[PDB]
Amino acid sequence: ETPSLLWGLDPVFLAFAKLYIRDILDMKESRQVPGVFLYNGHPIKQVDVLGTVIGVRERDAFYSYGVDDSTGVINCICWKKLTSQLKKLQETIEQKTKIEIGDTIRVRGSIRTYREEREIHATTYYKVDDPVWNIQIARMLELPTIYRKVYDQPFHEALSNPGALDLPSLTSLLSEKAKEFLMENRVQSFYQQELEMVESLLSLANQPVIHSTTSKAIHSIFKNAIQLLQEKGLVFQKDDGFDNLYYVTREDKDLHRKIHRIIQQDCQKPNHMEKGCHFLHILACARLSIRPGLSEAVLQQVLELLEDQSDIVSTMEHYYTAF
């Protein structure tokens, strides 16, 4: 069983446990300390019952009421006990202890075994005024709940650790959580130093791998992580003077209304030739127009995007379509 030194850590040790009298009459008593009973490994020192009086036996100074609560019957041993306010108070605490057969009584005390028949020695008892049977109905609904939640329960990583995996494995472990910032924040364009001030992406960069100026070396971990979004083909930049400005391909659609207006003339050529256009028939009108060093990762990734504008027939790979 549970050792005696570990009993006081249980919070039910110092509480009046709301138990059935079927459980009070069936709990095992501890061989260590007599007077303490164990239900499911919890030390039960004192209880709290509510039931109907079915017997009254008076002695000199105590009563011994029998109490039934539809689960069991047990004997409870209840010990006998400005001047206009004290007098009428004493005729109130004598009507709470005027108990006959058929009344409802609340008894809070401690279990004392008496050679294979148990009793409850009440430190506090009174007569419960239950005219419409409300209190004894609310106890039948509460007692399965306090059992199942309290008395039946027993008493008792590379993302999380980025400092282990090093820098060539950490650039590809920062860009995917940098990409999710760009999704719901409707960001059209950004600078490189704007991501170096978000604490959601700064604490995942200055790991103890980079002890070999640290705050100058965190520019290198952000530059090599943003670039992986560019060789994959999701961000891009135009010739504007500074090298830290980037644009997201997914958000801006002035470029999407230049890739859609090439079909207005069937890529500006008649169709005596090869049927339709190709992926590189855009390329003769896109790099000479916009940027000569435009990467091919974003050339057809825009055509992956506007496919639900009823644009052309995506009949197969490596092939554009005319009307």
Binding site: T52, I54, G102, P131, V132, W133, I137, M140, L141, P144
Partner: peptide
Amino acid sequence: RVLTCVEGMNLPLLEQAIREQ
């Protein structure tokens, strides 16, 4: 042995509480 008169008792709530017990 006991025959007590309750009136105003929530009888659908009483026979509910017998089912959870």
